[PDB]
Design a protein around this ligand. Structure first.
Ligand SMILES: CC(C)c1c(-c2cnn(C3CCN(C(=O)CCl)CC3)c2)[nH]c2c(C#N)cnn2c1=O
Ligand SMILES: [Mn+2]
Ligand SMILES: [Mn+2]
Ligand SMILES: [Zn+2]
Length: 453
C-alpha cells in the first residue's frame, strides 16, 4: 500500500508577475520554502518552440537497477531509438497503450517494484550537460538563422540558458569555469527511470523545465527538515554515510516517502507535465521518477536570499570533510572587486556577508598567531588549481588564508587545522594570505557606496 503525500503548491502567475523570474521567486518564497518544491505554470501563450531532429541527436545511456535503499553513484542511442525502446518497454510492462496507463497506477507500481527483491527491473536514461550533440531545448544564438518565434524567446528570463547570467543572480560574475553550476543539464527519461534523494551543491536553488513527453513525478522536503531526513536515512541505510574520496564518488538512494512520513518528516508530491516548471529551494531534499518517455532541462541558481545559506553550507562541508565545488569567499571578493557594476540590492547583500567574513577572518588570524605562527606572505590563491589548495584535514578550498610549511612542500591546512599539517614546530610555518585586513575594508566600502546610491 502507498499513501500519496499531499500536493505541493502550484502557482499560475499573470504575465506581469511572470515577466521577472527573480522577483516572482522572491514573492512566492514564504509559501514555497515551507514545502521545499513548488510548481509554476507559465501564462498560456508563453510557449517556447521545440526544434530537434530525432535521428541526429545522440547520447550514451546510463543504466539503473531499481532497488529501495540500495546505493547508487552520483552503447549509444539516438533520440528516436531511445524513444522506441522506452515506449515498447512501458506498453509491454502494462500490456496497455501508453496514454491509458493512469499516473496513479505508475506511482503505485513504482513503489511496489523497488521494494520487492524478487523483481530485477533495470531501466536506462540520459543525463548530461549540453554539447554539440545534444544541445539545449531552448533557443540559443549561433551563426542557423532563427525564426522570429525562436528570437522572441532568446532573451527570456525563463530560458534556462539566461537565468544564471542575469543581474539578480550572484553566480553571474563568477569566472572560475565550474561547468556543473552555470550550465543546464538535459534529462531524457523513460518509465520508472528515477532520481535519488539529494540536495544541490552548495545548497543552491534549482529550476527544472519539462519540454515535452509524459509527466515527471516529484517528492520534496522543506529546507528546515533536512537534518531530520538525514537522521532517518542514517538509521535505515548506514552504508550511504561512509565518507568517499571524491566529489564524483557520492552515494544516493531510493526511499519510499511514506517511510519519511512515518518518522514525522514532511513530504510533498507533484506531477510535472509538459510546459511546466518545478523549483526547488535551498537545502530542500527531492527525488522522483519519470512516467514515460520525456525530455527535461534544469539549472542551478543562487539569489541574494541564498548568500548566507551558502556561507553556512561551506561551514557544514568543513565539519563533514566534504569537497567544495568553488570557494564562497572567492566569489564574494570577486563581486566586491566589481562593485561599480553590481545591482544595488546585490551590492547591499554582499556587503553584509563580507562583514561577517572579515570578522571571522580577523579572529582566525589572531588564534593562529597565538599558536606561534609568525612568518607570513601574500599568496594569489585564485591562480592555483583547486586540488592544489584544499585543506589536508577538512578538504575545504582555501582562499582567504592557509598555513604552509617547508617541511611538507605544497601542502596546506585552513586556519581551523593548524595542528594537522606536519610534525615541525609552528615557528617553521607560514601564514599565506590573499588580502591584509587593510585591503579588505576599502573593498567593503565600495559595496556600501554602490548600495547607498
Ligand atoms: C532519471 C534522470 C533522467 C534524471 C536525473 C538524474 C539521474 N542521474 N543523474 C545524475 C547525473 C550525474 N550527477 C552529477 O553530475 C551531479 Cl550534478 C548526479 C546525478 C541525474 N535527475 C533529475 C532531476 C533532479 N534533480 C529531475 N529530473 N531528473 C531526471 O529525470
Ligand atoms: Mn527490486
Ligand atoms: Mn536536483
Ligand atoms: Zn581545514
Amino acid at each position: 500500500m502507498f499513501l500519496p503525500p499531499p500536493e505541493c503548491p502550484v502557482f499560475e502567475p499573470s504575465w506581469e508577475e511572470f515577466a521577472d523570474p527573480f522577483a516572482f521567486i522572491h514573492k512566492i518564497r514564504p509559501i514555497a520554502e515551507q514545502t521545499g518544491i513548488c510548481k509554476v505554470r507559465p501564462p498560456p501563450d508563453w510557449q517556447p518552440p521545440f526544434a530537434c531532429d530525432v535521428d541526429k541527436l545522440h547520447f550514451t545511456p546510463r543504466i539503473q537497477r531499481l532497488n529501495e535503499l540500495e546505493a547508487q553513484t552520483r552503447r549509444d542511442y539516438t533520440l528516436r531509438t531511445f524513444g522506441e525502446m522506452a515506449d515498447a518497454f512501458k506498453s509491454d510492462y502494462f500490456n496497455m497503450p501508453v496514454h491509458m496507463v493512469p499516473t496513479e497506477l505508475v506511482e503505485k507500481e513504482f513503489w511496489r517494484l523497488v521494494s520487492t527483491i524478487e523483481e530485477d527491473v533495470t531501466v536506462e536514461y540520459g543525463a548530461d550537460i549540453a554539447s554539440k550533440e545534444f544541445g539545449s531545448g531552448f533557443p540559443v544564438r549561433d551563426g542557423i538563422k532563427l525564426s522570429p518565434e525562436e528570437e522572441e524567446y532568446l532573451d527570456s528570463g525563463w530560458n534556462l540558458n539566461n537565468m544564471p547570467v542575469m543581474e539578480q543572480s550572484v553566480l553571474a560574475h563568477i569566472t572560475a569555469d565550474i561547468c556543473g553550476m552555470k550550465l543546464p543539464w538535459l534529462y531524457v527519461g523513460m518509465c520508472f527511470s528515477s532520481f535519488c534523494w539529494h540536495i544541490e551543491d552548495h545548497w543552491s536553488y534549482s529550476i527544472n523545465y519539462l519540454h515535452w513527453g509524459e509527466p515527471k513525478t516529484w517528492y520534496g522536503v522543506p529546507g528546515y527538515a533536512a537534518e531530520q531526513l538525514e537522521n532517518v536515512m542514517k538509521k535505515l541505510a548506514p552504508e550511504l554515510f561512509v565518507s568517499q574520496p571524491d566529489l564524483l564518488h557520492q552515494l544516493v538512494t531510493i526511499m519510499n516517502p511514506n517511510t519519511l512520513m512515518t518518522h514525522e518528516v514532511p513530504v510533498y508530491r507533484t506531477n510535472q507535465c509538459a510546459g511546466e516548471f518545478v523549483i526547488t529551494f535551498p537545502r530542500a531534499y527531492h527525488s522522483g521518477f519519470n512516467q514515460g518517455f520525456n525530455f527535461a532541462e534544469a539549472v542551478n541558481f543562487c539569489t541574494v536570499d541564498w548568500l548566507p545559506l551558502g556561507r553556512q553550507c561551506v561551514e557544514h562541508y568543513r565539519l563533514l570533510h566534504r569537497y567544495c565545488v568553488f570557494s564562497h569567499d572567492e566569489m564574494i571578493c570577486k563581486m566586491a572587486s566589481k562593485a561599480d557594476v553590481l545591482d544595488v540590492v546585490v551590492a547591499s547583500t554582499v556587503q553584509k556577508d563580507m562583514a561577517i567574513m572579515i570578522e571571522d577572518e580577523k579572529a582566525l588570524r589572531e588564534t593562529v598567531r597565538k599558536l606561534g605562527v609568525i612568518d607570513s606572505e601574500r599568496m594569489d590563491f585564485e591562480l592555483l588549481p583547486d586540488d592544489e589548495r584544499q585543506c589536508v584535514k577538512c578538504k575545504t578550498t582555501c582562499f582567504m588564508s592557509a598555513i604552509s610549511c617547508s617541511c611538507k612542500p605544497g601542502l596546506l591546512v585552513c586556519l581551523h587545522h593548524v595542528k594537522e599539517l606536519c610534525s615541525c614546530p609552528p615557528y617553521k610555518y607560514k601564514l599565506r594570505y590573499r588580502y591584509t585586513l587593510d585591503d579588505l575594508y576599502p573593498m567593503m566600502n565600495a559595496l556600501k557606496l554602490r548600495a547607498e546610491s
